Amino acid sequence: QDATNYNSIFANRFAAFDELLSILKTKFACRVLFEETLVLPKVGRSRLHLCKDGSPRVIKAVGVQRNGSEFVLLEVDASDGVKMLSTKVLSGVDSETWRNDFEKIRRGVVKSSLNWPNSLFDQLYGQDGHRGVNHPKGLGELQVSREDMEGWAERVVRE
Incomplete structure (x- = not known):
């Protein structure tokens, strides 16, 4: 299982996501502890660990710090x-166990045909430790207004 951080060469695939972060640092006073983009693993006879063009599908994890x-x-x-519809917010994560936890999560995502392994999420951080934030309606199809881009951040910080 490849664990190399290919953050910069996959940066172009997270234009919307990378903009959300910028809004959090300026408008919401957030700090980014780390940014890592990892390759999703093949699990069994899985298909969606790849993209339509045969390139590996990736998952990006961003560690944030806001007011403690x-x-x-x-x-x-x-x-x-192939659209995910939500972003996963994880709270109460230990830096000394993240590398291993993430590996388990990646397997879980692919095993559920590109779906959040909510059960696994419960086991790790409890029912109140993880939540899903919906994407701005029609993300990837249209441009998102600056207010809606801020509203996206609002929904994230709301948690």
């Missing part, structure tokens, strides 16, 4: 038109 609070954002590569 610390949480992790999970966003899955949707560049080839």
Whole structure:
């Protein structure tokens, strides 16, 4: 299982996501502890660990710190038109166990045909430790207004 951080060469696949972060740092006073983009693994006879063009599908994790609070954002590569509809917010994550936890999560995502393994999420951070934030309506199909881009951040911080 490849664990190399290919953050910069997959940066183009998270234009919307990377903009959300910028809004959090300026309008919501957030700090980014780390940014890592990892490859999704093949699990069994899985298909969606790849993109339509045969390239690996990736998942980006961003560690954030806001007013003492610390949480992790999970966003899955949707560049080839298969859309995730939500972003995963993880709270109460230990830096000494993240590398291993993430590996388990990636397997879980692919095993559920590109779906959040909510059960696994319960096991790790409890029912109140993880939540899903819906994407701006029609993301990837249209441009999102600056207010809606801020509203996206609002929904994230709301948690």
